[PDB]
């Protein structure tokens, strides 16, 4: 799948056997991107 | 966080009266009471709803992520 | 978590009838009617309108528990007067007064400004 | 007419100050209760979030979205989603309106209620349009975006009762006062010295006759004159608030009458 860095606006797609670090950054803090399958919210 | 859309107690819309309120404090240099009065907030529950509120979202927007 | 659905306050459940007419075993010519999915709004009004009828000996409503949207209404009328007819007369009276009130408010509103 | 009477003292777009005459207390109270809760209104009930990079949480936004006042004029020719024979929702029961916001300028990009755009087919019915009583014409401040923050979502608004959720509340605060002189003695006033000098005098006192000390207590008096002030939020005009309130009460009484008509079946 894909991931996004923390302290920079990027869009890595490195799956397993890759992990850290980031593309043109230097830090190893990687967050996971939002799901494509939408979720509904009862506006209450 | 951000200005509550409607007053808890009664139900009057107060979310559209935030910015205006601020103006009435800095542009016309009024006190909080008169500013709240001019916005049609006669009941002290809504008056509370605006006066008592703290806009924290401005400090939240200070982050880059 | 254990909180019930909100629509259970006005939507009738599976098999639950709107009204439950039960023969009161205490005093003769009396009846207890269970109103489902209704609160004080209807009960207080109907009860107050059942006291206007001078052929009604007793009329009282109660909500046995605020958790559940329902209330019981006990009615006792004079002999030769079925209580259901008292309820009907009360209801129709309410409807008429409300209609007249609506007409009056409309006519009064058509004469205003701003 | 012939029964209860109305006397409009003040009237505007947002408020109606009037006097209910020749009415029982329970009917005035019930009218108030119906005006508060049991009046159908269109409000956001479903929120589908695609992208949300704003500060606020998802359901945090969805909540205030639900509280947004929407046009509920022709709400009576709209239908409950629970009654319509459609899957989930459709155009005969719900109103779908989108929201697409994105930080553009270096300054904070505000997201108001005017940014809501109706998508579903209204087919003639005056409905769904978010009420904007704002002077600048912005409406309710929903959110705030930084520089590259985006908020993309869709809202399905359905017909609902304020009894189910306060977001479907057509009215705000309803002022209600009977017998400004305590001539019915429904209230034993609290005091330290003088009861009259301490407790403030109501405005409605201008519309009734003060008691005479030479006169005894009128024990055979009831409550006839009521002073009301109904305030609307915007979804439904004040006159239509009280009128649809009356019609709702009348209708739900007529349903009980109809039930009595139905229980005669073998
Ligand atoms: Zn990076
Ligand atoms: Zn309030
Ligand atoms: Zn439908």
Give the CATH number for residue B33: 1.10.10.60
State whether residue A41 sits within 8 Å of chain D by CB.
yes
Ligand 1 centre distance from Cα of residue A21 (Å): 8
Is B61–D146 a contact, with Cβ atoms under 8 angstroms apart? yes
Element containing residue C100 per DSSP (H, E): helix C83-109
Residues within 5 Å of ion ligand 3, judged at the Cβ atom: D 84, 86, 90, 92-93
Element containing residue D70 per DSSP (H, E): strand D70-72
Could you say which ligand is closest to the alpha carbon of residue D166?
A: 2
Element containing residue C35 per DSSP (H, E): strand C30-36
Q: What angle do CA D102, D104, D108 make, to 5 degrees?
A: 90
Given a contact cutoff of 8 angstroms between Cβ atoms, the answer to whether C75 and C84 are in contact is no
Ligand 2 centre distance from Cα of residue D212 (Å): 38
CATH topology of domain D1-40+167-266: Gyrase A; domain 2 (3.30.1360)
Ligand 2 centre distance from Cα of residue D67 (Å): 14
Domain, as residue range, for B50:
1-65
Structural domain count of chain B: 1
Given a contact cutoff of 8 angstroms between Cβ atoms, the answer to whether D109 and D138 are in contact is no
Answer CATH for D41-166 from 2.170.120.12, 3.20.20.150, 2.60.40.1260, 2.60.40.1250: 2.170.120.12
Domain, as residue range, for A34:
1-44
The whole-angstrom separation of Cα C40 and Cα D249 is 12
The whole-angstrom separation of Cα D254 and Cα C92 is 8
Domains annotated for chain C, with CATH where assigned, are: 1-114 (3.30.1360.10)
Give the CATH number for residue A3: 2.20.28.30
Q: Is the dihedral of CA D25, D31, D35, D37 positive or negative?
A: positive
The whole-angstrom separation of Cα D266 and Cα D258 is 16
Using a CB-CB cut-off of 8 Å, the residues of chain B touching A27 are: none
Q: What are the residues facing D153 on neighbouring strands?
A: D49, D99
Could you say which of C84, C95, C104 has the minimum Cβ distance to residue D260?
C84
The whole-angstrom separation of Cα C9 and Cα D163 is 8
Rounded-to-5 percentages of helix, strand, coil across chain C: 35, 25, 40
Resolution (A): 3.2
CATH 3.30.1360.10 segments of chain D: 1-40+167-266
């Amino acid at each position: 799948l894909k991931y996004i860095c923390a302290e920079c606006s990027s869009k890595l797609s490195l799956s397993r056997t890759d992990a850290v670090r980031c593309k043109d950054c230097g830090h190893r803090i990687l967050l996971k991107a939002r799901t494509k399958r939408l979720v509904q919210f009862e506006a209450r | 966080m951000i200005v509550p859309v409607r007053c808890f107690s009664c139900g009057k819309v107060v979310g559209d009266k935030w910015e205006s309120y601020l103006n009435l404090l800095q542009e016309d240099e009024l006190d909080e009471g008169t500013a709240l009065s001019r916005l049609g907030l006669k009941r002290y529950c809504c008056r509370r709803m605006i006066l008592t509120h703290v806009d924290l979202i401005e400090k939240f927007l200070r982050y880059n992520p | 978590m254990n909180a019930p659905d909100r629509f259970e306050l006005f939507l009738l459940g599976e098999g639950e009838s709107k009204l439950k007419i039960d023969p009161d075993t205490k005093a003769p010519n009396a009846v207890v009617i269970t109103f489902e999915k209704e609160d004080h709004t209807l009960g207080n009004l109907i009860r107050a309108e059942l006291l206007n009828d001078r052929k009604v000996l007793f009329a009282a409503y109660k909500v046995e528990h605020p958790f559940f949207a329902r209330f019981k209404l006990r009615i006792q009328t004079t002999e030769g007067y079925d209580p259901k007819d008292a309820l009907k007369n009360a209801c129709n009276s309410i409807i008429n007064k409300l209609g007249a009130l609506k007409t009056n408010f409309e006519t009064e509103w058509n004469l205003q400004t701003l | 007419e012939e029964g209860p009477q109305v006397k409009i003292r003040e009237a505007s777009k947002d408020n109606v100050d009037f006097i209910l005459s020749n009415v029982d207390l329970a009917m005035a109270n019930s009218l108030r209760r119906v005006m508060i809760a049991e009046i159908p209104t269109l409000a956001i009930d479903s929120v589908e979030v695609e992208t949300n990079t704003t500060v606020l949480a998802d359901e945090f936004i969805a909540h205030r979205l639900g509280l947004i006042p929407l046009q509920s004029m022709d709400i009576e020719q709209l239908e409950y989603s629970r009654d319509c024979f459609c899957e989930d929702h459709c155009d005969k029961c719900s109103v779908v309106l989108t929201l697409q916001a994105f930080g553009e300028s270096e300054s904070t990009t505000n997201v108001y209620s005017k940014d809501l755009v109706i998508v579903s087919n209204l087919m003639g019915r005056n409905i769904g349009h978010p009420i904007i009583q704002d002077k600048e014409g912005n409406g309710v401040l929903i959110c705030k975006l930084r520089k590259g923050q985006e908020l993309k979502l869709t809202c399905v608004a359905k017909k609902g009762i304020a009894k189910e959720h306060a977001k479907w509340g057509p009215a705000a605060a309803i002022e209600f006062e009977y017998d400004p002189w305590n001539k019915l003695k429904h209230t034993d006033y609290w005091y330290e010295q003088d009861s009259a000098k301490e407790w403030p005098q109501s405005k409605n006192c201008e519309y009734e006759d003060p008691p005479n000390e030479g006169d005894p207590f009128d024990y055979k008096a009831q409550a006839d004159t009521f002073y009301m002030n109904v305030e609307s939020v915007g979804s439904i005009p004040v006159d239509q608030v009280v009128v649809r309130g009356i019609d709702t009460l009348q209708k739900k009484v007529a349903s009980i009458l109809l039930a009595l008509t139905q229980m005669d079946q073998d």
